[PDB]
């Protein structure tokens, strides 16, 4: 027979704290918070002016790039944050907000999986506070602004084949990826060609995530270039006095949202940019918010270690200027087959020959974090049934040969007691710590040499080759004033080359770079190995078309 | 001797929304807060507890002048009014729209010492009402385009799609786009465009549902597009409604909220008042007929516009009947309508009042002999004021049998509304139930406009072009002649044409386009150009618009 529980089932089935409980445990008064239900709060960013800083423990949680077969990465963090929690320690795990476009394509998800997640689940795949609403508005704000300008008078000398800016919808809508507007009569604008990004793309969502505060964000929002005038020269937000008004749509915004895991241990869900053309981390003020109200933060970067972890070190950590005290590694031994070249549908038998061909993708990453960045870290393996002890002792073997101790996690199944053994070796690693980070790169380089620092040291790529226009973008972007700035390389996710085929760990490659550009606001270079798709689109099927509601306002069909 | 309304709006002490819901009988449990100023009330509230059968009191007013008349501030100072006199009332009104405050700057709800508070936060994202419709409205759009994409097995015709994309932006440049652009895999290549989220139709339904399941319903009824066949596809066709209805699920619940002087306001829902019926939602002016005893509330435009279509369209699909209507005009701007120019509306003018008058006489017959509705003439007194120019306005207006009350809500309160308030109350204990619509569902499209035209506006009759004589017969076949009709004309006359101010006689009235919202559940018919899309200044109000260190907004007003 059989008896399951899906995690919707187990996000039901909970009894969550109303969040001013959970706002005590973080010293939180009902005059620091502002309620959006029972179960969801704002919290305001002026607490940190007026309480004392706990100067507590930042925990990157990553893993290894991502396959088929899953590797439960946010899992992980919601589970170890609660084992924390389960070892009296004073603990806030950071997360990022999901987009909503998706649920209606592929249906929604929940925070985490099994017994780690984070609730009310439904409310944070929706609506949530409203935040990504705010994100749109003002990134339409600008777009409708810059229009308005070069249609009434175009002073700027704006060249409209040279605009950048993007407008943006948070929907699945492929219909919307290259449109041209302006069409009709003299008063219906200055027809140009257009295009709509999902909303967490947008470049307000990058600078929203990585300002420390109201006028930080007002600051960044300000260097935003959204096009170049006929002399070349860049267009920027503040020339066309619109970072004000963005700023004043995302005041509520840019405060962290407050909610809590099953096991009521406090979460933090504040923004969620991409992890190729951004940065792939939650906000900068909610991860700087966490430090400040508790002894350990257990935050995460989307898309592995070769991108979220290598952007979170090399651009969060720059910005916020913090440092992790250690990193969780996530793997499990069914993507670590999948490297080794089993397919998908294979990933259930033992294979101790292929599960050997794909550990050089678990030991690339750990030699990045311990041995390029210099942090401690710890390999958590979520463990399955079928996981044989040959298997683990393999992958433990390999890793200690890094000096890097291998944890089993069982927190999808367990809760917060599944991650006791991970937690425990993170708190070990604190303590025996040193204060060794080392960025990839300097600043003081040049485009070009901080690619190649972070292809060569990070990808384990012979370096990095350049199309005729990417070397023509990238001196402008070099004479503009540019090249202090980190870049955002973004590449495949699924190999550590930029050939999503290569598994494993490849070698005597070289990374093909084939257009680079300016998020001036989010203050990083951008640089292209490819196609970036920015806008998804809806399958043959939708998830909307199960969707229902019923007589009492009850939604079914989401998960 | 006092300043402007943000001013008003920030020395006020608004109480905790949980003690306004207090005052109408709702818990902690039938609550959720946005903030302790805001809060979400929910909608099965109804089903758990006795109706009150409040009353039902209709501001509406003459055709909007240059000159202002003050309607949304003479209901909140009338409902503050019957507060003063221990009544248990609730005013409701409608959320304004984002996106014009990024033009032309924000505003007050109301005005002057008859306000509803928090100004600022109703002026932008309120409870994320706008957001959701824009959102339900934006799926639609992609789960329609998704369809032609993948199999079109449906035969939609892509130069019949009606459905147009939304944004909460006054981004002149969505007017007219061609999307579908790009390679293969990017869509299908069709001319397209956007409006304002307010213009959407599922504004028009979400305002016209009494319940989540009227409201799943009604978006399922929405006509997105025609097949080849020339038969209307729904967005039921596309499955689409129950995720609309999904996405709104929580901005179907009133929001609460509450005045200067304490007096609970519900804030729910902002149609156009042209291209329809420019009312609060029903579930708000249910919701608060279910709480309190008086329900004060209000439509957009004028009595030939907000109030016919309250009557007829509105009244119709909730089951409700106003008991008294609250007619709000001023001397300038009957002066207006008499001849004067803007600038000279300062003067004492009895004879150009007497010319202006019959404008609002028009409306006063409309509201008490064809709709058989009691009436009160509220007049928003202003200091120069003569009283002669008040004493003929209280002598024509009782040559039809209505009380003129003056009106003091903008400068003193709830103090004075009580002189209007008063009247109301006369009326609703003296009244009968004599409540008629203007036309009948069985009528024919034409013989409902011909109703509209000659008994509300004063035409000699309804004029069609060919293209609208063919649109209203294709209407007629498709099976949608028994819906109520929504005329979209100007609001500044009672004619189509917005030069004849007054009272106009000898004209007749031009209809160029007639559309379907099966969704709401009604016929739109046009007179002329409708703008769904505004265009920002040479200057936006926006570039004044900032924020200081601690978050603090200014330049908003
Ligand atoms: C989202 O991440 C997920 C999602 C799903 C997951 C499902 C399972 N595990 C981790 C997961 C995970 O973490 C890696 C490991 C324990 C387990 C035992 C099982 C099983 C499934 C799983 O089927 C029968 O016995
Ligand atoms: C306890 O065992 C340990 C402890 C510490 C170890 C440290 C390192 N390694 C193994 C270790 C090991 O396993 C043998 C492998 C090579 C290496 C290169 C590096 C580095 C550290 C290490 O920093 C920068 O470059
Ligand atoms: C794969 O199946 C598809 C996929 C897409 C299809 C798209 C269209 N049609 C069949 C399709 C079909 O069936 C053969 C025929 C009706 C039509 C009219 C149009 C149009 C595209 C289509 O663009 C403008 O006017
Ligand atoms: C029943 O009659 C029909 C039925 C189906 C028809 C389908 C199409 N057209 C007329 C039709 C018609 O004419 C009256 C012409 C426009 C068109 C563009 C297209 C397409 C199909 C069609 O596929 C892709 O681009
Ligand atoms: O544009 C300005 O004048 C300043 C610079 C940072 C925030 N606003
Ligand atoms: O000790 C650390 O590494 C972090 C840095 C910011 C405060 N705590
Ligand atoms: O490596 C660097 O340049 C800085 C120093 C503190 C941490 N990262
Ligand atoms: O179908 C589309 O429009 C995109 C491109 C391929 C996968 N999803
Ligand atoms: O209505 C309000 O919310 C304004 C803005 C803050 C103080 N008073
Ligand atoms: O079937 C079609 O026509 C579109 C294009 C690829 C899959 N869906
Ligand atoms: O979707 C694609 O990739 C093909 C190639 C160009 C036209 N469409
Ligand atoms: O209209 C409705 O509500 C249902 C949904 C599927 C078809 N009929
Ligand atoms: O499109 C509009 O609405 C304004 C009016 C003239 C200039 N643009």
């Known amino acids: 027979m059989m008896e399951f529980k899906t995690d919707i089932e187990i996000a039901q089935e909970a009894n969550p704290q109303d969040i001013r409980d959970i706002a005590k445990k973080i010293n939180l008064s009902e005059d620091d918070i502002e309620l959006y239900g029972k179960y969801k709060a704002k919290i305001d960013y002026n607490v940190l002016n007026r309480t004392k800083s706990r100067a507590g423990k ?18 992980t963090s919601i589970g170890v944050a609660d084992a924390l929690a389960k070892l009296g320690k004073n603990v806030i795990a950071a997360l990022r907000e999901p987009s909503m476009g998706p649920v209606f394509g592929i249906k929604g998800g929940a925070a ?77 604008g200055v027809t140009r060609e257009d295009g709509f990004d999902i909303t967490v793309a947008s470049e307000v969502m990058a600078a929203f995530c990585l300002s420390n505060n109201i006028s930080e964000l007002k600051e960044n929002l300000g260097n935003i270039v959204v ?35 099953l096991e009521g241990t406090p979460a933090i869900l504040h923004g969620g940019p991409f992890a190729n053309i951004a940065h792939g981390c939650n906000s900068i003020i909610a991860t700087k918010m966490g430090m400040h109200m508790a002894d350990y933060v257990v935050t995460e970067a989307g898309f592995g270690a070769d991108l979220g972890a ?66 401690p870290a710890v390999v958590a393996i979520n463990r399955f049934p079928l996981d044989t002890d040959a298997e683990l002792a393999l992958v433990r073997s390999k890793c200690e040969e890094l000096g890097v101790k291998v944890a089993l996690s069982e927190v999808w199944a367990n809760g917060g007691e599944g991650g006791i053994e991970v937690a425990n070796e993170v708190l070990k690693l604190i303590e025996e710590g040193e204060n060794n980070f080392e960025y990839c790169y300097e600043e003081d380089m040049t485009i070009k040499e901080k690619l190649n620092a972070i292809a060569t040291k990070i990808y384990g790529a ?98």
Request: hydrophobic share 40%; net charge neutral; aromatic share 6%.
């Open 58 to 75: 930042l925990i990157l949680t990553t893993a290894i790039n991502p396959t088929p077969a899953g590797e439960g990465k946010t899992t």
């Open 112 to 188: 985490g999986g099994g017994y780690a997640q984070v609730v009310p689940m439904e409310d944070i795949n929706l609506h949530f506070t409203g935040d990504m609403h705010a994100i749109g508005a003002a990134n339409n704000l600008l777009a409708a602004m810059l229009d308005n300008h070069v249609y009434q008078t175009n002073s700027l000398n704006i060249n409209p084949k040279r605009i950048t800016w993007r407008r943006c919808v948070d929907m699945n809508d492929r219909q919307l990826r290259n449109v041209v507007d302006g069409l009709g009569k003299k008063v219906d």
């Open 227 to 261: 096009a170049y005038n006929y002399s070349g020269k860049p267009v920027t937000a503040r020339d066309l006095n619109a970072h004000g008004a963005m700023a004043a749509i995302l005041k509520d915004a840019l405060k962290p949202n407050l909610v809590q895991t």
């Open 310 to 375: 290598e952007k979170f070190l090399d651009i969060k950590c720059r910005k916020a200027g913090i440092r992790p005290d250690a990193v969780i590694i996530v793997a499990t031994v069914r993507a670590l087959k999948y490297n080794g070249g089993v397919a998908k549908d294979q990933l259930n038998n033992e294979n101790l020959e292929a599960l050997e061909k794909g550990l050089p993708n678990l030991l690339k990453h750990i030699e990045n974090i311990t041995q390029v960045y210099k942090i």
């Open 462 to 559: 012979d370096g990095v080759n350049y199309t005729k226009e990417a070397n023509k973008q990238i001196a402008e972007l070099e004479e503009l004033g540019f090249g202090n700035l980190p870049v955002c390389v973004a590449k495949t996710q699924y190999s550590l080359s930029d050939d999503q085929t290569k598994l494993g760990r490849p070698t005597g490659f070289t990374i093909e770079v084939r257009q680079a550009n300016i998020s001036a606001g989010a203050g990083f270079v951008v640089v292209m190995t490819g196609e970036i798709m920015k806008m998804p689109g809806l399958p043959k099927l939708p998830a909307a078309e199960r969707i229902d509601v019923d007589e009492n306002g009850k939604i079914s069909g989401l998960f």
